[PDB]
């Protein structure tokens with residue numbers, strides 16, 4: 001019943017553009033929205049976020065997260081490993097590659113979401129969330145070698161899955177970091193389950 | 195180690211602006227980023243709230259209450275937690291309970307409130323509180339919940355059982371063109387993984 005009529009370019013940078021979207025509301029009234037989009041895209045989604053479940057025998061299962069300076073936030077953020085899917089990459093292979101570049105861990109695909117929206121009220125950005133298990137007892141994940149690209153500076157933070165929410169709240173309280181909303185949502189639901 | 199050096203306005207719509215952010219990398223080199231901000235954030239902890247609304251009713255399984263709306267940035271319908279911006283001088287909790295009532299008709303009770311968490315930290319400074327609210331669906335107020343949507347708000351309510359949320363989201367996505375929000379999907383995955 002609602003649909004897009006027209007999009008006007010307001011401003012196009014190298015990575016990000018701003019548009020004025022004209023749309024028809026359900027009453028038949030024409031309305032405008034300021035929208036952000038990535039400047040270029042081919043793929044199912046722009047991206048993947050990886051939920052990396054570090055499994056080591058006789059240890060608590062851990063969720064592997066990353067801490068990086070985020071210039072739009074002006075500070076440090078705790079996030080699932082994540083990056084853009086390359087032209088030609090499957091979401092799954094983008095997931096293993098990012099996880100390896102960012103954390104040094106080599107993992108196994110467990111499941112892969114459909115494309116899900118990051119911030120549908122601002123952007124059109126979408127990602128696949130990819131659940132990956134990491135056999136922490138395997139020799140390749142003994143001394144994980146993080147292979148960061150140019151301009152990535154990633155700190156790795158493993159937290160126990162059974163206390164994730166309390167551990168993140170502790171990090172926020174003491175380290176003045178911002179936790180990512182997907183990470184927090186995941187952590188909440190681990191507590192809210194049954 | 196890393197910090198912002200300057201923020202230069204590239205373009206400023208009524209609601210969203212684009213900025214060229216210059217920051218110091220951890221090697222001591224200057225880099226830039228393109229950042230999105232809102233134009234009207236007041237002296238508050240976070241822009242907005244998303245509500246995790248747990249509908250509780252005797253001899254019913256708990257439901258997560260979700261909303262479906264047309265999102266002009268996305269060019270389509272999205273399934274999301276009820277959500278909105280925090281008004282000047284409004285607390286996160288008041289905003290959560292008010293957006294929930296406006297969008298769904300339900301009157302909730304606060305359970306918990308997250309710190310400010312980042313929506314898409316490689317793009318914007320946007321942050322939200324994720325507020326968990328229980329809804330007593332046995333209370334007469336919550337019997338025939340009538341939405342009070344504001345001007346230009348057009349929201350459908352969808353209540354899904356907590357105990358099957360991920361499969362139920364998958365069935366909705368299977369039946370139509372519709373994107374699930376990444377927070378909702380992250381929360382449904384954790385419910386499975388617990």
Ligand SMILES: O=C(Nc1ccccc1)Nc1cccnc1
Pocket residue numbers: 015016017036037038039046047048049082083084118123124125127314316317
């Ligand atoms: O790429 C973005 N987010 C993201 C990508 C991969 C994984 C996780 C998050 N947001 C964005 C950037 C530039 C223009 N519009 C939106």
Ligand SMILES: O=C(Nc1ccccc1)Nc1cccnc1
Pocket residue numbers: 119121122209210211230231232233241242243244277278279313318320322
């Ligand atoms: O408002 C935003 N997100 C949001 C707000 C409330 C609840 C859920 C999500 N993002 C945004 C908008 C304008 C400029 N930059 C970012």
Ligand SMILES: [Cl-]
Pocket residue numbers: 053110131133387
């Ligand atoms: Cl798992």
Ligand SMILES: [Mg+2]
Pocket residue numbers: 081082083102
């Ligand atoms: Mg990354």
Ligand SMILES: [Mg+2]
Pocket residue numbers: 082083098101102152
């Ligand atoms: Mg990366």
Ligand SMILES: [Mg+2]
Pocket residue numbers: 276277278293297
């Ligand atoms: Mg809303």
Ligand SMILES: [Mg+2]
Pocket residue numbers: 277278293296297347
């Ligand atoms: Mg609203």
